[PDB]
Every structure is written in C-alpha cells, then in structure tokens.
Design a protein around this nucleic acid. Structure first.
Lengths: 204, 194, 193, 200
DNA sequence: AGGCGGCACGGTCTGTTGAG
DNA sequence: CTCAACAGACCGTGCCGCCTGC
C-alpha cells in the first residue's frame, strides 16, 4: 500500500551510513539496522547495494536539477543565481542526510548501473554555461578563463571539510565566493556581491 | 636492509590496485598475485592490510618532507616557495601510482600518531602564507584560510597543470599587493610544464 | 481454473533441466506469466508443487492401465512402448521422471514401487497362463526391469533401445513354444510415426 | 602433505551427503561439520562446490581405469572381464560412499572436456569390449552390441540406489546370460557368477 | 620466509506471509 | 489473485596465524 514511504526510510539512513562510513564498509546488516526493516525488505526495493548507490545518486542529480531551473523564473540572473545555487546545496549538505553522501559517492567509487551520467560534468557544465552568461553582461571580466574557472569552482565547493563538523560547511563557502569575486567582478559593483555573500550563510 | 626489495615491489602493486579500484575493493587475493610473491612473504614485511595504508601514506608524507626542504635550501620568497610547491606536489600525482594511492587512500583513515596529510598540507600553507605576509608579498587583511581547502581537486576531480595556475591568478588578484602582483602573476605562468 | 494447468506445465519445463531444487520460484512465476501471489492461491508451497506434478503422472499411469481388453504378457509389453511414447511427449511426465529420481517429497503411492509392484501383477497373471515359466524368481524380474528405459541420457532412438532389449528376456523367460509370438510383437511395436 | 589427510576427509564426507541428500541440497555448512574441518579449510582445496564434482567424478572415473589395468591381459576372455568387473563396482558402491556418489551424479554437471563423462566412459568399455566377445563364442552373431550398450549401462542402477545392490546384480547377470550366451558356456559363465557374488 | 588451515560475514536471494 | 514485507542461511572468500614434509 502506502509502504512506498517505507523505502526512503533506509535511503535517508543509508546515506548517513554512506557519507560517514564510506561505500565498501557499509554492511547491509548495518544499513538494515539503521532503518527499521529486515534483510529481505531491503531487497524488495533494491537488487544489490550497487543499486542502492546508483538510485541514491539520482536523488542528488534530480534535487539539484529542480533547484537550478525552478529556483529561477523570477529574480537573480547570470552570476547572481550561481551564488544562490550553492547557498542551498550547502544547506542540504548539512540539513539533509541524503545528498551529502552523493558528494562522496561520486569520488570514492562511481556506480555501475546504466547509464552513467557523472555528476561532476553536470556541475562543470551547469556552471560553465552560466559562467558564459556573465561575460556578455559585464558582470565579470572578459580576459579571464572560460573553462579553467568552472573546474576550479566545483572543487573548492567540495573541499572535503569527516575532518570538521557540519557547522563550518555553509559558512566557509561564503569565504570561497569572497575571494573569487576579487578576480572576476570589475571592481565597480564588487561590494554588490559581498553584501549578498555575507547574508546567504544561515539559510537554504 | 639488503634484499628488502621484496617489500619494495609489494607496495608498488598495492598502490596501483589501491588507485585503479579502491582500498577494500582490492583484496589480498590479487594484491599478492599482481605483485609476485606469496602471502607468507607478505606477512614478513607487513603485519596486516592496514599496515599498507600506513606505509603508503608515510611515503606520501615522506616525499612531502623532501620537496618541502628542497625549496628552503636555495633562496626563494615565502610566497614563491609556496607556489612553486603546488606545481611540484602536482607533477608527482600525474606520473607515479606509488604516490597517487596516497591521494586515493587519504580521502575515503591514517594510523596514529602519524600527522594526517590534509592537516599537514593545510598547515604547510598557513605557516608559509604567513611569512609571505611578513615579507609583504601577501596582504595582511585577508585571512590566511585561504588554504588547501581550494587546492583539493587539482588532481582529484577526474595539459592538466594549466588548471593549477588558472586558480593562482584568481588568488594573486586579491591577496597580493597590486605592486608585487605583476611579478608572481607572470612568475606562475612562467612555466606550467617541467 | 485454467491457470491451475499453467503454473504446473510451464513449471515442468523448468523442472527437468534445472533439477527442481535449483529452480527458483521467481523464474517459475516469470516463465508461467502468473504472479508470485497467484501461485500461492493454487499451491502455497514449492513442496506442494512436486506432489502436484507427480499426481498428474501416477494418475496417467493408472489411466493407461484401463487397457486389459490382450494376453496378460502383452498387457505389459504394450505398456512399455506406450510409456516411452509419453515421457518424450511434452514437458510433463519427464518432469515427474526427473523428480522421482532425486529426493521426492511424495505423499499418491511410491515413485517406483508402483511400477515394480503393479508392473509385476500384469506379469504374474501371465505365468498362470503359461506365457512365462512357473519356476523362476518373478520378483527378481520387476526389480531389474524398470531401468533400461531410464536410458543413458537422464540420441533419439528409444524403441530400438527397448525392442532389441526385450528380446533378451524372451529367450530365458518365455517358453520356446510361443517365443516368436512376442518377438515379432516388438519390431511391430518398434514403429511409431 | 597432511592436506592429503584432510582433503580426503572432506571429499569422503561430501560424497556421503551427495549419495543420500543429493547435490542440490547438500548444505555447505553441514559438510565441514560432517567431515571435521572449517569453512576455510575446505576453500583451500575447493573454491566452489562444483569442484566437489570434478574431484569426486574424477575418482569415479580414474577408479574405472584402475579396474581395467588390473584386468589387462591377465588371462580372462572377452566376456569374463566384464563379469568380474561388474562386481568390481559392487565394491565401493557399499563399502565407500565415494564411488557410490559417482553412480548417482547423472544429473549434476550438465559437458566440459576432457572429462570422460561416466556414461560415454561406460558405454565405450562395454561396446568396444564386446566386439571381441562376439568372435570367441560367448555372443551370438545377431545381437546388436550398440543396442545392449544402452541397456548394460542403465542396468547397473539395479535398485532404489539410483540394500540393495550387490545381490540384485547377481540376478541381473543370471537373467542376461540366458539370452546372449551359447548354451555350451551358459552354465559355465553362471558358475563364476553365482559364486562371484557371495563376497561382494 | 612455506603450504594449511580458522572463523566469520561480506552480499545475493530465496520461499514465504500480513495489509485493505 | 495482489503489492508489500519477512527472516534466514544460501555459498564465496577475505583475512589472518596455527604446526606443517613438498
């Protein structure tokens, strides 16, 4: 019946088990423990734990797909919506147990279920195709890089940060943009983005 | 240490399998068949599987101690020694897999009390990017962190070192004074291939 | 229902080659077209499926038993070439043959002690009519008669595998009197198509 | 090699459970406890339990060739060999479950050369040894050897073991001499066949 | 520094029964 | 005749350290 809800009950806890322990360390006895289900109830929705990793990566590529287009519509444009794009994933990497594992389950092991659209080329091209918009609007410089800044961006956005608690993850991201707009914005409206960066910290 | 090359060829294949697979993805089955010796010889140089991910990181932080002292033996500027160190610590993670596994192991667990590479590399910059402020090659206002948090996926997220100097421009155009900026900008693009 | 004969016939082609025990209840459902909740309204067990596929065999061995209209020795030799033309006719019977060989969760009488006890009655009654010698160990015959037809493949030539096998018995069992009366009754039963 | 003392302990208890419960039911957790080893001591000798088939049917096949070199040119005829050989398999069909499992695995392994296959290796030794048993009497000049080949191999099944084998075979041979052998050596070939049973 | 062996879970999935 | 969930061993083997005759 409505026990289709009793399916993300393990995903929201297999991600916390994926992000903290890693992939090849998450025992299915441990995953099925942090949930409230039995060894066979997990198999009814997932063939292998490789199928629990390729489906948990769709909950990431589809939760940033509806936050990079549905977030638009009205308000923000070019290099102004790129900041709000990050200050929201930075929240869901803290206030959400799911997609903070997808950032790790995309470097320490790619899933093996066809097809394989890698999420890094989904960020090193959603930013590039939006970074290209800032040159034709005088929001950034014109002599700067065109493709060497995108892979530089989705990079410091990661920064691993695990090592440190999830309290300085959305607030250190504000320092990343603080240094970035120093070598991009043509100085005139440089403080127009610092005013936004220092205020996007404590929200989603 | 005479015929100790037995353990010198174990970590050579142990690092290649820790890179083209993973840590636990690689078992002792192939790691002794891909190397070329029995398990009875493996347990004469190493105590366990974790002692490999403890003898590989301690050769990654042993190379991060030789090249770190080879730039302080000439006469570089503190900011110059820091930026010619990120091009040296990136020309090694492209060729040899014996040091690429340390890039792969220290991500998905080091054995105590060895200093972790992330904690070490992030404090190598802070110590260097502070004497680079005492020489007034870096402004005093900007917080020095500003560290390896940005120089992370330089090789992870995968000409290639051209991406390294591409972000050095964005840093110098912000933390380095506008006068001494013309030096380190053209002295970082001076050579991206060596 | 009609599906009662569906999850038992499609489950017969997946029983012989696989070996029953190695046949998953998932592939049975997938190869029958039914559901995993439809099987358990008609069987409720994979053990109850074996007893269900042997009952359609033992009740077709006693359904061919209603043929007591020739000589008592012939009302048995005709069953031999009447059984070889059944275990090749479709997946059924063969799946019952494959199941009876290995572990049989039977109980429908015994798997083979019905073809050894009731395939000797239609032979002992052929002794009191003097088609079989009265001074032979008759129980020693049925215990060593239900093989051969089991075959060394458990080609396609099976009647000749049994016709030139029946001849060995009709030389030391059936008297020299009516010996050819059943020798010729094998080359004529050797032709099917 | 002490492993030979252990590898023989595992393969023996494995064939005992193969003879009774079959291959598709022999629990691996029950073998190591029925033999006296551990789950890993078995893996050092057998990866998967398909190697408990190419190691059991390897003995069943080699012991067939070891019961042919003892009867090479010993002095037996071309039919006296198959007579003292059918009671040769009657040995380890009761005294040892090893070869007893060999005369049972007719479904498992369904096929991979150069495995002799326990039926092509028994139809051959029957057919290619009756070609000389049709010359020096013993076999009539009309009995198709290729037809009794598929009959001779099945017949060794005998009983429920597919007792009751070492005595059911005696009647199986006595009822087969009368219908294949001349009436001059019919009472002479059943001679060392009624006595060729009171010990096997 | 051997070949042989000790336990234990890694995950895959099996034949099953309560919601409605 | 259904979609759901149920526990449980099924077989691999991974990783180690006991006494072990090639």
């Amino acid at each position: 019946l409505r026990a289709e809800q009793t399916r993300a009950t393990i995903i929201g806890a297999a991600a916390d088990l994926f992000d903290r322990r890693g992939y090849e360390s998450t025992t299915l006895s441990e995953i099925v423990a942090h949930a409230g289900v039995t060894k066979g109830a997990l198999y009814f929705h997932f063939a292998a734990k490789e199928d629990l990793a390729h489906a948990i990566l769709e909950i990431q590529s589809r939760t940033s797909r509806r936050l990079a287009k549905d977030l638009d519509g009205r308000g923000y444009s070019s290099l102004e919506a790129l900041m709000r794009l990050t200050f929201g994933m930075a929240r869901l990497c803290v206030q959400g147990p799911v997609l903070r594992a997808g950032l790790r389950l995309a470097t320490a092991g790619v899933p093996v279920r066809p097809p394989l659209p890698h999420p890094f080329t989904e960020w090193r091209e959603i930013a590039t195709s939006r970074l290209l918009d800032a040159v034709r609007q005088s929001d950034v410089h014109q002599d700067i890089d065109v493709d060497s800044v995108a892979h530089t961006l989705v990079c410091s956005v990661v920064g691993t940060r695990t090592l440190e608690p999830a309290g300085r993850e959305p607030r250190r991201l504000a320092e990343m943009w603080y240094i970035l707009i120093r070598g991009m914005v043509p100085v005139t409206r440089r403080a127009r983005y610092v005013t936004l960066a220092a205020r996007l910290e404590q929200e989603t």
